[PDB]
Ligand binder design. Structure first.
Ligand SMILES: *[C@@H]1O[C@H](CO)[C@@H](O[C@@H]2O[C@H](CO)[C@@H](O)[C@H](O)[C@H]2NC(C)=O)[C@H](O)[C@H]1NC(C)=O
Lengths: 52, 53
């Protein structure tokens, strides 16, 4: 119950949240980019044949 | 000569060439390959967040 101790403990928790939030943000952004790339590739493949 | 009139023989063109006229549809989708090429190179840039921090 030291005045510094229950502050050090909260300092421990106040950084894993930031780290995990960054990780989830990166995962979401990468998934969105991959989906967009797959969609554009399929669209181009479909688009060539009708022109020909 | 006498009562009958005489006319010169007519020369004839030896060959003819046939070049029929064709309708012009003027479709616009063809010769648009450049737009497809532009679609190919979208190049979305994403920078990892948290690696720097
Ligand atoms: C074949 O392509 C040529 C070139 O695109 C067409 O010629 C054009 O025809 C238009 C319409 O009469 C004119 O305004 C252009 O000046 C022409 N360009 C040239 C370079 O001649 C032609 O019409 C096409 N053939 C068919 C059957 O569509």
């Amino acid at each position: 119950n030291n005045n510094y101790s229950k502050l050090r403990s909260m300092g421990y928790a106040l950084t894993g949240a930031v780290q995990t939030l960054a990780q989830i943000s990166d995962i979401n952004d990468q998934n969105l980019q991959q989906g967009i790339y797959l969609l554009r590739d399929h669209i181009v493949t479909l688009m060539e044949a009708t022109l020909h | 000569c006498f009562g009958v009139t005489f006319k010169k023989p007519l020369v004839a063109e030896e060959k003819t060439s046939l070049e029929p006229q064709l309708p012009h549809l003027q479709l616009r989708l063809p010769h648009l390959v450049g737009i497809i090429a532009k679609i190919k190179g979208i190049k979305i840039e994403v920078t990892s967040s948290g690696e720097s921090i």
